[PDB]
Amino acid sequence: MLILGLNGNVSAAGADVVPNLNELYMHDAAATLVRDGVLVAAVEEERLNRIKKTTKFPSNAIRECLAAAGAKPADVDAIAYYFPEDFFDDIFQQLYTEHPSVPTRYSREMILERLRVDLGWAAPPDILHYVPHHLAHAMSTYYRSGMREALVVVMDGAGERNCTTIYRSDGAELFEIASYPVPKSLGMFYLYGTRHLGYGFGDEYKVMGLAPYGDPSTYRDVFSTLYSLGPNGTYELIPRGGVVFRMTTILREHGLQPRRRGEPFTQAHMDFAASVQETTEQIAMHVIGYWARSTGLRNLAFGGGVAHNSTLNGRILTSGLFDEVFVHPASHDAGSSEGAALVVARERGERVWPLPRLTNASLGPDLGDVDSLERTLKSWSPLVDVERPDDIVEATAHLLAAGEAIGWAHGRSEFGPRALGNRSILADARPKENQTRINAMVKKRESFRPFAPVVTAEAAGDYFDLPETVGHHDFMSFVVQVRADRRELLGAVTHVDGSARVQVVTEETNPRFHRLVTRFGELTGTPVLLNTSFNNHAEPIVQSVDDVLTSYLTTSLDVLVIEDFVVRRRTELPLALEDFTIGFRPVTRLVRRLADVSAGRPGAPEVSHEIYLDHTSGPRATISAAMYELLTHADGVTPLGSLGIELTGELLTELYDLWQGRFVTVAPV
Amino acid sequence: MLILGLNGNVSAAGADVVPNLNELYMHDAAATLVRDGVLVAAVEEERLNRIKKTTKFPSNAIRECLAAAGAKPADVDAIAYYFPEDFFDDIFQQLYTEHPSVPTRYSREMILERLRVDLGWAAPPDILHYVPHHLAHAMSTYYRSGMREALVVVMDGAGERNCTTIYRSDGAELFEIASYPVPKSLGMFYLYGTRHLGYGFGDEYKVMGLAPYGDPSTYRDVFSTLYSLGPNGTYELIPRGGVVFRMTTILREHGLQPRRRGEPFTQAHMDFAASVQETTEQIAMHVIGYWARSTGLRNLAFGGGVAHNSTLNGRILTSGLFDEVFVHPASHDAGSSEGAALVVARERGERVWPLPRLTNASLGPDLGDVDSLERTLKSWSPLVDVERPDDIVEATAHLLAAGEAIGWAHGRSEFGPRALGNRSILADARPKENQTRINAMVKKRESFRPFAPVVTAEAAGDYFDLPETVGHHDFMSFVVQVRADRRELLGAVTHVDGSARVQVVTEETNPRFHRLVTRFGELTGTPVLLNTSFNNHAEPIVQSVDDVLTSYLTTSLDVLVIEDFVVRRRTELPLALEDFTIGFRPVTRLVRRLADVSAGRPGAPEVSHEIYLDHTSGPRATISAAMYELLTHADGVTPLGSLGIELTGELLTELYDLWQGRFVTVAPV
Ligand SMILES: [Fe+3]
Ligand SMILES: [Fe+3]
Fold first, then answer.
1. In this complex, do A252 and B196 lie within 8 Å of one another by their Cβ atoms?
2. Considering just the CA atoms, what is the radius of gyration of chain B in Å?
3. Which keywords does this Swiss-Prot/TrEMBL entry list (chains A, B)?
4. B85 by DSSP, 3-state: which?
């Protein structure tokens, strides 16, 4: 049976269902394809529409999943949606009361319309089926664990009814044993803390990264008025919601004002981070500990968005409550779509359980074959030199050992937030100064951010203190201690408390990446690399050849390795664009705006030129009259060189700024 | 002692404190000036910035109040704000967590900055004082009643703590005896109902207008699951707030979807309106009845926004619980600003109580003197003919009796939502077809809307069944029955149940308007007129000469009476604008926008031209390339005739559309 699982809102490519549709309303849109129980293809819409954690309907994800799996629309037996229909339709109705001119169409109709318009794919209404949100999460987590018995815990932001649901397995089935209502959400608590630290939706892992620098005791007393642990795994949490969240009143009362975007981080900020992280662990371990003791289960499969807290995951491993713990690479909403697919297949009669443990998150589209790639690379030759060594792994280990920081792109893209050796930025794990270098210089972000190591399965025990409890480390789900005698050596990837978010790579999972790490260690003595996501500040992980080339050229990475090829910039900045086109993204908007900005009596209006990305939280940039004129010609087909506009260094430098911001698409003819 | 009272948010003229600042966040911004306890000047910011129920800081209102009262900034002893400081600062902090780049400035600083920037008025921080929201409401309502003892009830949307507060007077002081928390808000319930009917914030009185057409029994069973009345004046109301309001789930469950803007009203819609109104009355009378019986008080002073429900007010009169009832012309937040002023004066030592009953809501700016007006009118002569009869009241009664519908503007503008004979549209109350005519034709709105009569104090008992309980009818606060033997006669102002929102005008309140109504009755036999607000669909009540002339000329009113002058259009449409200027409002935005709207590979972007008003819920209009070009010259100074652009009928008709929409300011040189 072939099932398509979906999550996300219903918005088209170009405009949203409502103006500035809340970013909480079905974020991390994705599609999964499940064939006889096996996840055969999976990718998040963000990788394709280039909008971080997008809520847009995942049309592109569907197209690519089908092609990646060698399936056609007609092969799909059913479509599974990650939330119940009456809940989703309740949300739409709410929206419609707030926006009187938006037509009252419900989710079923709207989903099918998207399939029809974007994919030319019409189906009978009853192809669509809907599933409880927590069950979707839980089925995904449990089935992908391969475990024959497990305590299965889902902790997130919010389902239709609960923030947290506890299940025990019963062979192929799940028995729900407990839940905690939406107001007790750890996900929502962590997000509030993240917003207080001057961040937004999606930035939770940054707070988790800052927390080790802080002292949880500075604000312990204040935090103790925000929650309590009760008997038998019960807890209370300060009730979110209202004109003013009660938490806001309390913080302001104690003299804590929220950090602004781009301000430095004080010790006070780090302390607050530590308090948010500590509080989250206290409650999560209170719940998990109680239910582990009560059920006597020693296998845990943990999911929902809170399972992306790898520090918490580490605490789970060291508690000694379990013998084995599994966390899915996509424990956020994108992963629950495949859980919906599993539920729907089961309801339809399919019996696939049990399945092998998921070991490989590389389920997105690949880069095409190497022949077509070589051809594409020739089209980029005004900007880059291309070489094809006898052995790409051999060449790459040498690049790494000589001290180069590289883009590394091959095979199918990683499903879930973590790069794992298919769309990675790589460098030596040893030099401590690589933290500043990859951050401040290459990615352009905050310096405090820690980096994650990858080690081979063969060498893991030589660098890390792996706990007695067996975690599955294929997806960087867990924090572990670096061996004390290796902390100095592993300068770029050891946090201030001696910890690291570790990727333990096996040959089976990723032979090329495993061989790379193996060879690097033969050359240097140390089979460990730094592995961070391949993206600048303005984009999600790169997906296509176009994305990879753009990202390489608009950051200051030393060199790009894509499939069999080594690619290096020919100049410092990619300014020779004569034979390149400029195009708009669906969300690009270019304006000449007039406004009378004087005080007193009205006077002559002033002209501004501006480009912006018309999605929730979309960036914006002032541009010159000359840039405006140029971009009126951004048709995605005409070469820049033959627009009869003089391509000055000034104009091209301005264009480069916009390319770096991803406001436009720059590609060869 | 001279106190300035303020309400509203802190936004500048041109942009809001945050993007798309919620319209609930301090709406109906206003300023009041209280001198030795007497309201000497009062006006809402909306009348000046031309934005309905604006949340913008009331800079213009302050300027005009000062000038209207013959005061300078330096004369003001203190500034009073209608909410507590810690509540307002809590709201800002909330906002700042949601918007990381907005600087964390608190209300005191931000208010004083507005005074400094907009008015050139600097003061020491401690000039500003803040007051509990319900006490502000209650002091305003009670003091303006002139009552020596009263039950004082405040029912609104939300204060900092309660939706409803009950007080009994103690001479000049108020003793709080009871409150109901914010989740029990009648104001919020009524707004939700209003949104379900395809309306928005501010439209509550439209729902109240529709309710008599409906049958409250159709949905009685459904509605009974939304609330209950308990012992001793207690009640429960369905808890608002959450992902989905529980009320939304219930409505959708029973097959009730929200009406879209501009759709026709079915019997089902009218029934729903009747249910919302009935429910509101059931609860309000449950609370008021209990407290009237418990306190034994037979004088009621009723305030807060729910006191603008004139149907409810009528039910209060007929209950027989009271001997006298007073409702302020501005019972919404604009009126509470003067309550804050009264509290602050009392705290500072002033003892003004008791004061005479408020009888006159005409406290805004006047139209200047008649000499300057005659001069201004000459400047409009390309568009209008101006005549100056010996006796304006005599001429006007004749216009009315001959069947003309008129604009009528004189003296100081009305404070609060109701026009009362200073900025009114007037017509014969007798012809039933005037309902369709003033609505569908002149104002451009829904046909169902009822119209309100004005009668003289001398004649009130001849047309209306005034209840035994004495209501103060100076401000159209109460609904009463039209005498059965006059319902047929008073065709334009009698609702389907025989009721009307009546204005009983005295000579003292408005001598000119009283004389007009008196003379009209001498001419026709019937001293009753239709009296509706002077505004089209796209604006609040007209304020200035410019506003009045614009409104007259951009609607299809027959004739304008302004002060001593009769003004008539020279052509059907005001197209001779050669000697007129065009200007932007502070919120006007004119754009040439590009976007690639194709599907498939990117292609050439498309150009759109558009003008919009950059405030929350601001209108927007597509315009032609030719209109765009023209408006680039809208400097508010250069005459249209000498721009060297050909003023075709087509272009001028398009301009007229925009003028009617208030997207631009059109005025003589
Ligand atoms: Fe989820
Ligand atoms: Fe209020």
1. no
2. 25
3. Antibiotic biosynthesis, Transferase
4. helix
Ligand nearest to the CA of B138: 2
Which residues lie across from A301 on neighbouring strands? A152, A326
What Cα–Cα distance (Å) separates residue B525 from each residue in B194, B202, B528? 40, 37, 9
Using alpha carbons only, what angle is made at residue A530 by residues A529 and A536, rounded to the nearest 5 degrees?
A: 145
Please give, rounded to a whole number of angstroms, the shortest distance from the CA of B608 to a CA of chain A.
Answer: 10
- A225 φ, ψ to 5°? -95, 0
Nearest residue of A to residue B604, measured between CA atoms: A635
CA of B300 to the centre of ligand 2 (A): 18
- Measure in Å the smallest separation between the Cα of B218 and chain A Cα atoms: 21
Show the tokens assigned to B523: 């001419």
Q: Distance, CA A39 to ligand 1 centroid (Å)?
A: 19
Burial class (CB in 10 A: 0-12, 13-18, 19+), A335: buried
d(CA A325, CA A318): 11
Closest CA to A429 of A311, A326, A313, A516: A516
Ligand nearest to the CA of A185: 1
- Amino acid identity at A377: L
What's the B156 CA to ligand 2 centre distance in angstroms? 6
What SS3 state is found at B263? coil
Report yes or no: B25 and B16 within 8 Å, Cβ to Cβ: no
Residue A53 CA to ligand 1 center (angstroms) comes to 13
CB-based contact B593 A590, cutoff 8 Å: yes
Q: Which two tokens stand for residue A260?
A: 């602004």
Q: Find the DSSP H helices in B71-185.
A: 85-98, 107-119, 133-145
Q: Is A617 helix (H, G, I), strand (E, B) or coil?
A: coil
Is there a contact between A14 and B597 if contact means CB atoms under 8 Å apart? yes
Task: Round to whole Å and give the CA distance between B402 and B400.
Answer: 5
Experimental method of this PDB entry: X-ray
Distances (CA, A) of B238 to A184, A495, B189, B228: 21, 50, 9, 9
Interface contact B591-A596, CB threshold 8 A: no
Q: Which of A195, A605, A636 shows the shortest C-beta gap to B584? A: A605
Beta-strand runs (E) in B472-605: 479-482, 499-501, 503-505, 528-533, 559-562, 565-569, 580-584, 588-595
Torsion of CA A470, A474, A476, A481, to 10 degrees: 40
- Say whether B242 and A241 touch across the interface (CB within 8 A): yes
Please tell me which of the candidates A100, A244, A593 has its beta carbon nearest to residue B198.
A100
**Closest by Cβ to B89, choosing from A158, A252, A632:** A252
Enclosing H/E stretch for A659 = helix A649-661
Q: Which among B427, B452, B25 has a CA at the least distance from the CA of B208? A: B452
H-helix or E-strand spanning residue B287: helix B267-295
The H or E element that residue A89 is part of is: helix A85-98
Q: Write the CB contacts of A221 (distance below 8 Å, at least 6 apart in sequence).
A: none
Q: Report how far apart, in Å, the C-alpha atoms of A235 and of each of A247, A278, A314 are.
A: 17, 15, 22
CB under 8 A, 24+ apart: contacts of A639-642: A639/A578, A639/A579, A639/A580, A639/A581, A639/A669, A640/A577, A640/A578, A640/A579, A640/A580, A640/A581, A640/A582, A641/A578, A641/A579
Expressed in angstroms and rounded, the spacing between residue B134 Cα and the centre of ligand 2 is: 7
User: Which residues of chain A does B184 touch, with a Cβ-Cβ cutoff of 8 Å?
Assistant: none
Q: Yes or no: say if B548 and B369 are a contact pair by the CB < 8 Å rule.
A: no
Of all ligands present, the nearest one to the C-alpha of B333 is 2
SS3 A158: coil
Residues of A in contact with B586 (CB under 8 A): 596
Distance CA B172, CA B149 (A): 9
CB-CB under 8 Å, B258 with A93 = yes
Say which of A118, A249, A634 has its CB closest to residue B605: A634
For residues A263 and A265, what is the distance between their CA atoms, to the nearest angstrom? 7
